Amino acid sequence: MMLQGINHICFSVSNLEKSIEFYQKILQAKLLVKGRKLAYFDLNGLWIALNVEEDIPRNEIKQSYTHMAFTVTNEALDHLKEVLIQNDVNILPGRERDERDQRSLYFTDPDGHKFEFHTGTLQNRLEYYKEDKKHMTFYIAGENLYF
Amino acid sequence: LQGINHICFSVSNLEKSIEFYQKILQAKLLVKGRKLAYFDLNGLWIALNVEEDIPRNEIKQSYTHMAFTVTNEALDHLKEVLIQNDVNILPGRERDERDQRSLYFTDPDGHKFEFHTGTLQNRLEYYKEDKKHM
Numbered sequence: 001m002m003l004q005g006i007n008h009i010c011f012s013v014s015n016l017e018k019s020i021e022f023y024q025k026i027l028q029a030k031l032l033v034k035g036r037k038l039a040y041f042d043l044n045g046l047w048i049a050l051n052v053e054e055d056i057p058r059n060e061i062k063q064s065y066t067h068m069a070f071t072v073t074n075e076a077l078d079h080l081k082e083v084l085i086q087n088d089v090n091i092l093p094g095r096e097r098d099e100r101d102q103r104s105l106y107f108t109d110p111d112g113h114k115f116e117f118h119t120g121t122l123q124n125r126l127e128y129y130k131e132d133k134k135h136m137t138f139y140i141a142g143e144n145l146y147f
Numbered sequence: 148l149q150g151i152n153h154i155c156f157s158v159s160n161l162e163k164s165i166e167f168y169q170k171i172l173q174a175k176l177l178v179k180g181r182k183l184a185y186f187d188l189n190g191l192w193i194a195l196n197v198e199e200d201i202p203r204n205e206i207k208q209s210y211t212h213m214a215f216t217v218t219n220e221a222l223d224h225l226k227e228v229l230i231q232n233d234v235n236i237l238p239g240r241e242r243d244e245r246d247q248r249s250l251y252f253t254d255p256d257g258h259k260f261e262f263h264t265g266t267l268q269n270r271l272e273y274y275k276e277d278k279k280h281m
């Protein structure tokens with residue numbers, strides 16, 4: 001039957017020791033336990049796992065726009081971009097934006113998993129597209145016309 | 148960080164993936180477009196963006212996946228949903244009983260998902276109980 005909500009995310013990593021420092025520093029995840037092949041994090045109530053897969057091809061992932069986004073404020077976005085620069089993170093060129101899309105930062109973990117810091121919400125994105133829609137509406141049936 | 152904003156999956160065929168996300172993950176469609184679709188799944192903003200031209204073969208070797216919470220009988224029923232919809236079911240990893248029950252599968256483009264019947268706390272305890280034992 002029904003799915004109740006998100007349970008956990010698992011990331012395949014090639015280096016447990018370096019991936020831990022990435023997820024702690026860049027994503028501010030709180031390490032809960034670690035072995036030699038696993039690490040569990042709490043990220044604001046979200047269970048995140050790192051599972052080691054030592055030698056797999058990780059080149060095609062760079063070509064896929066599949067990504068995970070986290071919410072930050074505008075001042076936080078600018079703090080984080082500097083943090084990502086001083087911590088040597090691969091920062092992706094994002095797509096062209098509209099100002100109504102709200103600002104974003106795209107980047108990857110040491111194994112190519114794409115992440116995003118976003119200032120907007122689903123609200124805005126739907127409020128965006130709906131305003132665009134209203135722009136193309138000239139006759140509102142039900143309205144009373146003069147003549 | 149304020150938590151998860153949204154998750155985006157690159158798909159090759161929009162209508163084919165939209166059905167998957169509708170029928171398998173039970174996500175509620177909000178809006179479609181030429182190369183996009185937005186859902187709401189248990190309060191999560193799920194987005195699909197289409198990219199037809201890219202190679203999607205190496206994604207098979209990575210254990211990277213996203214898990215959703217289900218009850219044990221939801222899992223039983225969901226297993227037949229997968230099979231009936233010819234969903235790419237992966238055989239599970241070796242599990243202790245305290246691992247709780249799971250079912251792993253992929254969407255048409257190789258993104259891996261899991262229906263899981265446990266919690267992190269369930270798992271931490273199974274790990275902690277191991278320490279207590281020793």
Ligand SMILES: C[C@@H]1O[C@@H]1P(=O)(O)O
Binds near residue numbers: 008009
């Ligand atoms: C919970 C971490 O994702 C791994 P599992 O699903 O193999 O337990």
Ligand SMILES: C[C@@H]1O[C@@H]1P(=O)(O)O
Binds near residue numbers: 116153154194
């Ligand atoms: C919101 C859907 O993920 C895409 P975007 O990040 O390019 O806007």
Ligand SMILES: [Zn+2]
Binds near residue numbers: 069116153155
């Ligand atoms: Zn995004």
Ligand SMILES: [Zn+2]
Binds near residue numbers: 214
């Ligand atoms: Zn899992």
